Write a protein that binds this DNA or RNA. Structure first.
Lengths: 145, 67, 45, 141, 80, 112, 67, 143, 63, 100
RNA sequence: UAAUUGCGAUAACGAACGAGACCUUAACCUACUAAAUAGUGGUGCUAGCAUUUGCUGGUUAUCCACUUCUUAGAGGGACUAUCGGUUUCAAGCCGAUGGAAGUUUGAGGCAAUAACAGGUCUGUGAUGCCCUUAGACGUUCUGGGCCGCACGCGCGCUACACUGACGGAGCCAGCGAGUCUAACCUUGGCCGAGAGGUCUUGGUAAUCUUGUGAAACUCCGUCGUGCUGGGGAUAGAGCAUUGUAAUUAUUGCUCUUCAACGAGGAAUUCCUAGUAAGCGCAAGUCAUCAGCUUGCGUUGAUUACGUCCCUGCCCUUUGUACACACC
RNA sequence: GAUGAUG
């Protein structure tokens, strides 16, 4: 272990999935800004991409980033087990997906609107803004808006 | 500072031998390298023989000037 | 029916609530205090 | 048989049994050298009964300790009581009275607990609080 | 059948069992005897039987709407 | 305290225990004030401070300042306590301990 | 507080007025005498009775005790 | 003078044996060394992703040497921890059963352990030779 | 300013509405055979030494 | 002929009359026996609120029933074993005899 | 004096209940009686390293001995004993030696007289009187609710971070519970990321689960004063366990979502040493569900050794136009 | 020797 000097090509931000990621944070924890990229999705993707995890996010070469992103978008192709993803057995498709960046919120608006048009109890509560997971509302969550 | 340019690497080696007592924190207020980079700085300067250890510990590193 | 609050009743007063089951007593806490001396539970410390 | 002695020490629930016999200078606790006792910071508590009277006295003896109960800190205090007690009981039976008296004088003048156990024990809890004396919070409105 | 057998025995020291005396008074009261006559009847017998003290308390609607207790005693009992 | 005693020797080439003692003897306030009143109305009044309490309130100040100086800071506890003990024994107004002492003794003189 | 109750004060008095020649200043000796000269129900009360009887014995050596 | 595993501090021995096995390279590694985390109580997989499995093997090796026998259950107990549970308080939670089973099956295929009467695993004559041999080296490196 | 030292020779009692102020008589080390009575703020015994910031202030009693 | 005679009672006094009877009876027949082994007392505790209706200061109460167990081993001819099992029946004490 | 506990005084004399004594538990005993369903040593058999007679383990189908540690039955011990100060010098009080133990040795159980229009007829086949008694307020079946949420309050649990979060190693308790008109506590083997699944096994228990290998804790590392790897609410999606049945998610697991909260205003609670406080475990309820309660142990300070200022309590004297008694 | 009304 020793200190090594580096070149001045460092880039202090970088655009992935239409979001800007800081370059002064270790690589694994830097990607977490991307919605969908949680703590244990960065750890696994960054080691399937075979990057030195000890370096900063701005220390990566151009090819490595696109190497990482390509894995992130089709995780199953690189043998990321199904149980690592945030969407499985999609209600309309039967397939598996991992949702990133803007897809996370857009899919979310689609999830509620499904229950709303069906007019199920869950969808009703969301449209009313209340708690939907069986909590008591008598004493809790008063100044939520 | 997270990573170091030449203008800083030489800066370390030229000022650190004057410190009466050095540690992970002392190298972070006299010069502005991060907490992580101070630790590798300490171990490198130990191998290179510029600073002595009084004791070594996971949470509190104590060094002094070489004699 | 095989289980629950309805499957167990105090053997003395038929009450459903407060029953103690430790050591298979199955006697409601109120009746236990009345019968404690005869059953053999005394008050020491 | 070779001379032998059995002694013990306690602190809270911890207890250690020290078998002592004429030997070559072994000091092992729990089947390991005395040099490997943990936690590290308190190694000199175990070394204390040796240093205070010189290593000379321990050359002709073998001491084997074993500890159970209590916790990491209380066990260490059990070991140090057993070692000091073993030496005094050995000199009682196999050397002479004077040596036992002078030994005892050194051990006591530094720390009484080396030979006499600590009489403190825990208090029971009482209903109405989380501890023997503490209580739940009271409110009036 | 044939394994469990019941025996009887006449209680020793008839006048020094609290169960016997309390049951004695209950039947006396149901028959119409006065409360003061009954309570002192129990007390007098127990003291004649060698007891070192007796105490009997009857609480309820003795005389009017309001409920109250009333105590009778002899000798010297202990409490603690 | 194993780390802190070590740092004192490096920073001053002096016996570390003796520095701890000097920090105690330069912090124990000598005069304090007491609430005194009648019927509820009250005021302060000056009194002397006893030997044992001089040591007690010395230790509390030295360790309260060292604890508060390290909180939400890059420096470790063994370091802030090390600096606190070094300055107080020197009699430096930089120390939390010394500044507080003079605040107590100034009030005492004004309420004699 | 180490005040002694009337049960102790009077049981001790009742033994001196009958057994002065046989009582001594020794607690251990007095303790064993009170087993053969009285019927007491507990070791604790017996120790206290013998203790205060010893206490009065010292007093009598100095002079007459009232009562 | 002779040497036994009990004569060397635990911290030194565990790293020493783990390195030896890493160089030797015939210990079977279960492949999921990058995905699995060591217990349900934890939140991040091991930080030393390269060598964590080798470290676990060394710890179990010494663990058997001290005592009669063990089982996969006894090791889950020993390698549990404090579950966060968030707002609610902590609670002991047992470790990964798969990982601890495949370090004991691996250790048998290398010959360091064997099944024993009365259940569980146990040291073998060959196991004691390897661990004892490495203890004497670790002492030699005290210079 | 100078500071003088004195030695407690008796503890007279306790004062203050709440008992946190003991009362003492002292004997000055230099120029002994001069004694003053004053109040103290912490636990105190005989033969203690007190540092007096001003020597000549004899102290009042609340009773 | 190995036998193990056990005893369980909630009151020691009666149980020492039975045990002392057994050992003193065996020594007059010069049988070989183990001593009376006294196993740890196991206590039973029940905790309960005094109040029958929920009101008032929270006052809790504890009860205790105690169990003392003992056993002896005998190696004796069957004829003496027969009368041994028959004697020393006492209220409040429970006995069990096992062969081999 | 902790005490209407004592010394005494005395128009009172001798007594009874309460306090103390008493019982339970926690500390000590190399002294009695015993004990593998608890232990230790030695010896048969045996693995490893060195090999001079050494160090550490295995073998509960080897057998022998012993009781220091563990268990109980019966007993011993403390009485402030002894010594020095102090009050007419009486009850006592302060300190010291010795001792396991010297704040009535620590903690409890019990606990008088006289009262409350305290709580309970929703513990009782304990009860008077009023009401209801077949289109019932009886009994029982299906489905809801007691969990509904603009807000106000009371016990609590997580936090707001380097005295730290995360990762790998180190590695230690005590109190308990466990299978009939039957399914309880579960070692061990194997599959699975995980929860969990499957085949076996011991224990009706000092025998087995269970050294309950628990947590905080120590060591070596990664991060570095950034609402940041502190914080984990509120949400999406999938896999499991208990149950006839989980929708208003019972609970557990996995990925993702990643809010308030930067030490807290007026106020206010608890506490004097193995105590407060930090940490978790067994038991009660229990098919499943603890952020609660009853006990238990592990780590272990700071500050008085006082006073009557605030809140109250006990005794005497004193005033009163109070008696539902200062509301 | 500060303040303190009412049910």
């Amino acid at each position: 272990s020793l200190v090594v000097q580096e070149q001045g090509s460092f880039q202090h931000i970088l655009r992935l999935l239409n979001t800007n990621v800081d370059g002064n944070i270790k690589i694994v924890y830097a990607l977490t800004t991307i919605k969908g990229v949680g703590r244990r999705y960065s750890n696994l993707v960054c080691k399937k991409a075979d990057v030195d995890l000890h370096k900063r996010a701005g220390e990566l070469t151009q090819e490595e980033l696109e190497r990482i992103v390509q894995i992130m978008q089709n995780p199953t192709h690189y043998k990321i087990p199904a149980w690592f993803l945030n969407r499985q057995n999609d209600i309309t498709d039967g397939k598996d997906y991992h949702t990133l960046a803007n897809n996370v919120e857009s899919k979310l608006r689609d999830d509620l609107e499904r229950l709303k048009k069906i007019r199920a109890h869950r969808g009703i509560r969301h449209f009313w803004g209340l708690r939907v997971r069986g909590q008591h509302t008598k004493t809790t969550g008063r100044r939520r808006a | 500072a997270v990573i170091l340019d030449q203008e800083k690497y030489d800066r370390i080696l030229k000022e650190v031998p004057t410190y009466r007592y050095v540690s992970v924190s002392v190298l972070v207020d006299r010069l502005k390298i991060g907490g992580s980079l101070a630790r590798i700085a300490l171990r490198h300067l130990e191998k290179e023989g510029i600073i002595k250890p009084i004791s070594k510990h996971s949470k509190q590193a104590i060094y002094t000037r070489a004699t | 029916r095989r289980y629950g609050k309805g499957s167990r009743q105090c053997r003395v007063c038929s009450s459903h609530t407060g029953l103690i089951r430790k050591y298979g007593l199955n006697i409601c806490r109120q009746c236990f205090r009345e019968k404690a001396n005869d059953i053999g539970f005394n008050k020491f410390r | 048989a070779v001379p032998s002695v059995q002694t013990f020490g306690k602190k809270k629930s911890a207890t250690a049994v020290a078998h002592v016999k004429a030997g070559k200078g072994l000091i092992k606790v729990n089947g390991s050298p005395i040099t490997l006792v943990e936690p590290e910071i308190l190694r000199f508590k175990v070394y204390e009964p040796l240093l205070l009277v010189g290593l000379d006295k321990f050359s002709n003896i073998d001491i084997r300790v074993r500890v159970t109960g209590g916790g990491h800190v209380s066990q260490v205090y059990a070991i140090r009581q057993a070692i000091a007690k073993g030496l005094v009981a050995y000199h009682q039976k196999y050397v002479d009275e004077q040596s036992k008296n002078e030994l005892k004088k050194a051990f006591t003048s530094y720390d009484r607990t080396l030979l006499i156990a600590d009489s403190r024990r825990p208090e029971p809890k009482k209903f109405g609080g989380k501890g023997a004396r503490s209580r739940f919070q009271k409110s009036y409105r | 059948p044939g394994t469990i057998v019941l025996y009887a025995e006449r209680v020793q020291d008839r006048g020094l069992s609290a169960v016997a005396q309390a049951e004695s008074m209950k039947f006396k009261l149901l028959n119409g005897l006065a409360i003061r006559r009954a309570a002192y009847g129990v007390v007098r017998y127990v003291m004649e039987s060698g007891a070192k003290g007796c105490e009997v308390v009857v609480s309820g609607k003795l005389r009017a709407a309001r409920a109250k207790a009333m105590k009778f005693a002899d000798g010297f009992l202990i409490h603690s | 305290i194993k780390h802190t005693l070590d740092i004192i020797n490096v920073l001053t080439d002096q016996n570390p225990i003796q520095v701890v003692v000097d920090a105690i003897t330069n912090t124990g306030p000598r005069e304090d004030t007491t609430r005194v009143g009648g019927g509820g109305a009250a005021r302060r009044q000056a009194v002397d401070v006893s030997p044992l309490r001089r040591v007690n309130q010395a230790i509390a100040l030295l360790t309260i300042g060292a604890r508060e100086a390290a909180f939400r800071n890059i420096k470790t506890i063994a370091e802030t306590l090390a600096e606190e003990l070094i300055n107080a024994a020197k009699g430096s107004s930089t120390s939390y301990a010394i500044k507080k002492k003079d605040e107590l003794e100034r009030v005492a003189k004004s309420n004699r | 507080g180490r005040v002694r109750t009337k049960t102790v004060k009077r049981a001790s008095k009742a033994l001196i007025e009958r057994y002065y020649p046989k009582l001594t200043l020794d607690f251990q000796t007095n303790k064993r005498l009170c087993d053969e000269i009285a019927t007491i129900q507990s070791k604790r009360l017996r120790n206290k009775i013998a203790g205060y009887t010893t206490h009065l014995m010292k007093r009598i050596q100095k002079g007459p005790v009232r009562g | 003078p002779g040497v036994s595993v009990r004569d060397v501090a635990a911290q030194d021995f565990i790293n020493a044996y783990a390195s030896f096995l890493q160089r030797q390279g015939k210990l079977e590694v279960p492949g999921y060394v990058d995905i699995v985390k060591t217990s349900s109580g934890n939140e991040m997989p091991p930080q030393d992703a390269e060598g964590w499995f080798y470290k676990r093997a060394a710890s179990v090796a010494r663990h058997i040497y001290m005592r009669k026998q063990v089982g996969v259950g006894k090791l889950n107990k020993l390698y549990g921890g404090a579950k966060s549970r968030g707002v609610r308080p902590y609670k002991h939670i047992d470790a990964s059963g798969s990982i601890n089973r495949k370090v004991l099956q691996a250790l048998e295929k290398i010959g360091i352990v064997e099944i024993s009467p009365k259940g569980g695993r146990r040291i073998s004559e060959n196991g004691q030779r390897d661990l004892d041999r490495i203890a004497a080296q670790t002492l030699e490196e005290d210079e | 300013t100078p500071v003088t030292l004195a030695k407690v020779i008796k503890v007279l009692g306790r004062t203050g509405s709440r008992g946190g102020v003991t009362q003492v008589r002292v004997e000055f080390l230099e120029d002994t055979s001069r004694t003053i009575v004053r109040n103290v703020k912490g636990p105190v015994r005989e033969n203690d030494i007190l540092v007096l910031m001003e020597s000549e202030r004899e102290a009042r009693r609340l009773r | 002929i190995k036998i193990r005679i056990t005893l369980t009672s909630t009151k020691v006094k009666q149980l020492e009359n039975v045990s002392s009877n057994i050992v003193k009876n065996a020594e007059q027949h010069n049988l070989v026996k183990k001593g009376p082994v006294r196993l740890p007392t196991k206590v039973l505790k029940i905790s309960t609120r005094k109040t029958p209706n929920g009101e008032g200061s929270k006052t809790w109460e504890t009860y205790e029933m105690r169990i003392h167990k003992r056993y002896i081993d005998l190696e004796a001819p069957v004829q003496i074993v027969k009368r041994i099992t028959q004697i020393t029946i006492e209220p409040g004490v429970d006995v069990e005899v096992v062969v081999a």
